[PDB]
Amino acid sequence: KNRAARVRVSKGDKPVTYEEAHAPHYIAHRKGWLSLHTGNLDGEDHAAERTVEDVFLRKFMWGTFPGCLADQLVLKRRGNQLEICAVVLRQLSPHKYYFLVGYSETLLSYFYKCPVRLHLQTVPSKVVYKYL
Amino acid sequence: DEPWKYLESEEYQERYGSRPVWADYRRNHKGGVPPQRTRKTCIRRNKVVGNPCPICRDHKLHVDFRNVKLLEQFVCAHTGIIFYAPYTGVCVKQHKRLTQAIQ
Amino acid sequence: DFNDKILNEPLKHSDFFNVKELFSVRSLFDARVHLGHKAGCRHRFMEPYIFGSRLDHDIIDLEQTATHLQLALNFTAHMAYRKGIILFISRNRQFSYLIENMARDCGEYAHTRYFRGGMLTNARLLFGPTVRLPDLIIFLHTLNNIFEPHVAVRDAAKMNIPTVGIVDTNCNPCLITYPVPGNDDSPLAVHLYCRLFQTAITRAKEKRQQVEALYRLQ
Amino acid sequence: SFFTKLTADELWKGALAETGAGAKKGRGKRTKKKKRKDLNRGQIIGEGRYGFLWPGLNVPLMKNGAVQTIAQRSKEEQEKVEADMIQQREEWDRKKKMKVKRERGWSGNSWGGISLGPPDPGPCGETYEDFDTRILEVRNVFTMTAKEGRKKSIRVLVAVGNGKGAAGFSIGKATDRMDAFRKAKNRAVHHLHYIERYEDHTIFHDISLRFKRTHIKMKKQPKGYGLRCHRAIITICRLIGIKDMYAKVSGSINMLSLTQGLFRGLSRQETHQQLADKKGLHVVEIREECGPLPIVVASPRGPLRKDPEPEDEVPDVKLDWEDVKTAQGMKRSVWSNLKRAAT
RNA sequence: AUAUACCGCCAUCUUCAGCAAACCCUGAUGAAGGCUACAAAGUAAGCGCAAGUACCCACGUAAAGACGUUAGGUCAAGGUGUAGCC
Ligand SMILES: [Mg+2]
Ligand SMILES: [Mg+2]
Ligand SMILES: [Mg+2]
Ligand SMILES: [Mg+2]
Ligand SMILES: [Mg+2]
Ligand SMILES: [Mg+2]
Ligand SMILES: [Zn+2]
Ligand SMILES: [Zn+2]
């Protein structure tokens, strides 16, 4: 009996997402990686910094877009340029959405001394894979 | 109001309905059978006691010989004998007052 | 309301679809319907339908047989003219082919195979929320292979469905609405009941169609 | 550190401790429960202790058709907003924690005289708001298992009725209280027992029977008699629609057998109309209020019989020494005639 | 300090195969049970097993291995409820 990044089977009243449902040993078999960089590859370096500041990015953006997201993020770092992809709901106003978009993008760029971009996908209700 | 028009007033009908007055009241007491004699009174020294009877809690109601439809519901329409105070839910004081009023 | 008048018209009439002309005690005795199992196979509630016994074999009262058969045919044809759903049951494997063929020929449906638990009670979850359960059940063989009362009579008595079964000396006509004494085992009796039901329901259908055609004309 | 900090739901789980030895085995704890709270829903995302006025989220972006500018909230304004937020949190907490007043039925902390309302509509669609439900009994059955051992299974008995002579009881077992209630409610609304009554408020005549070492006696009564019967019996009478009778129960006391025998007797009670139809005689009622006047109630639907019944003298009839005593007046007991509650 | 508040992470039977929401039925409507295929009341969501995926295959090995038991171990990975030094 192992407990690792997996949801307990309940009576059947727990909507779950794809990755939130599937186990951590199918990350390559039936899932994709949340992040894509080369520090893990051989010969590269600074992978520790990559991971640490990626965790920081995830936490900061999760807490500066609270209650709107419904899934984990997608990182995409091509050379210099950084890209983040998110999914959110449409309860708040596009005014606030764009204001926070610009604010967060500027903060990330000024902090990392790096060109950054961020995209969001709107949803009326978070997509559920199964009822667990 | 000292007269009996508070009954015909709509607050009475919306507050009670077609049922009698005693039907809404219920007694809090010891286990199983309740006591055989109700409380002495519901008001003392210009103060009301918790869980009062309906005729005492609704101060606008006024017991009197003339409010026939107000004091008729206690005595059974098919049995001329009045019900007892543990049945009607009211205290012995106003119960006796209503007895001499109906007489 | 004329539709309700047409629905009620056959009620006041007695022998209105001419079901009596179909059967006669001659045909019953020729098909050997009067037979019954041994006295050891006798049943209390079946006693009154036994005209007598011989050689440890029981004999059926053919007048009561014809009366119950007349009532059964009349009822079947009544709700057939009302388009009431019919459903046949016979656990006996000896006649599944014939039963299913005659069911196809009539247009009414049947279930000869193994009956599943609560197929009628939980039919909503099985089939769907909106399903028109049958309006009449009938039985060419009331008991199962192990000779217990088929669960369908219990299901119908529960969910208010009428039942018409041919009852042998071992059967239990208590739950059945219009139990007709007869010979569950003889192929002559099986074929006779088949042809009788076919003619009956076909005449009921034809009469419905011609009545509604007359009404469309008028 | 900030990296050490994490999301909320896991802290909530670790603080609530839903799963453990504490809860498993059903031992539980000494009734201490910190209730779930949601802080993110409460406060708006915009304001903090530094009171910058945000035109994008905190203030409407346009005013008088004029773009806005970043501004500062003054000391008194910040303090007043914080006091308003304190008041709002206090209001929310008060509204959260309050009393719960479920009607007192047979007694406190008991599921006897409580109604869950009518059954739910059917799948095909059948609303039965006319039906009213009551819970006769709730008990904690326990059966063991090799894997887990003592597992509790709530058993409940319920009844439902129109108040129009049509009703029915049922049972429901489940691990969950609400789920068992629902299952029993569905089973009752499916399985119905109808019974007739003489003048909409009484039985046809006195009855006496036993069922599983449970003796019961129904006693017909006239109007204004009331319902002086066991609490379950008066609940089922309220549900049926009869307003007065008497009943006595002796022997064993078991609620499910009680209800089963009750429905059996009240269904086997034979209508006096059908009695006359079978007999060939006219029914005649006589009252104490009405003088020597024959009140015909029913007649045979078929032809009346030619000759009348012969007089039956010293007939063989089984009866009750208790009723004999009460009729003779020799009986004495403080517990018989009391000023009990209303009906 | 409290693994006897817990989360998080694992040993255990497991070199198992059962766990089961939601319905029906039997037992007089009890705890409970629901199996007979030439078949007699069980139907099953879903989980798991399994299958497929990884290594050299389809076998094999790994991985996976639920419901629950040991108030199993871990407040010393880290955080956190309660009680304390403050
Ligand atoms: Mg392991
Ligand atoms: Mg109490
Ligand atoms: Mg421990
Ligand atoms: Mg496997
Ligand atoms: Mg392994
Ligand atoms: Mg331990
Ligand atoms: Zn008073
Ligand atoms: Zn036979």
Distance between the termini of chain B: 23 Å
Q: What level of helicity do the residues of chain D show?
A: 10-25%
Query: What sort of overall outline of chain B do the alpha carbons produce when their principal axes are compared?
Result: globular
Question: What ions, cofactors and ligands are bound?
Answer: magnesium ion, zinc ion
The helix fraction of chain B, in percent, is: 25-40%
The strand line-up of the biggest sheet of chain D is: 5-6-7-8
Order of helices and strands of chain D: HEEEEHEEEHEEEEHEHHEEH
Tell me the number of helical segments of chain D per DSSP (H or I, 4 or more residues long): 7
Continuous helix count of chain B = 6
For the biggest sheet of chain B, the summary is: none
Helical/strand content category of chain D? alpha+beta
Structural class of chain B: mainly alpha
H and E order of chain B = HHHHHH
Strand content of chain D: 15-25%
DSSP strand tally of chain B: 0
Beta-strand percentage range of chain B? under 5%
Number of DSSP strand runs of chain D: 14
Main β-sheet of chain D: number of strands, strand sense, barrel status?
Answer: 4 strands, antiparallel
Describe this structure in words.
The structure is cut from a larger assembly and holds chains A (132 residues), B (103 residues), C (218 residues) and D (343 residues). Chain B contains six helices and no strands. Chain B is mainly alpha-helical and 103 residues long. Chain C has one domain. In chain C, the strands form two sheets. Chain C has a five-stranded parallel β-sheet with strand order 4-3-5-6-7, with helices on both faces. The radius of gyration of chain C is 18 Å and the shape is globular. Chain D is of the alpha+beta class and 343 residues long. Chain D has seven helices and 14 strands. In chain D, strand 6 and strand 7 form a beta hairpin. Chains B and D meet through helix 5 of B and loops of D. Bound molecules: magnesium ion (6 copies) and zinc ion (2 copies). The site of one zinc ion (ZN) has 3 residues of chain C, from loops. Chain D binds one RNA strand of 86 nucleotides through helix 1, strand 5, strand 6, strand 7 and helix 3. Chain D: This is Small ribosomal subunit protein uS5m. Chain D: One of its GO terms (biological process) is mitochondrial translation. Chain D: It comes from Homo sapiens (Human).
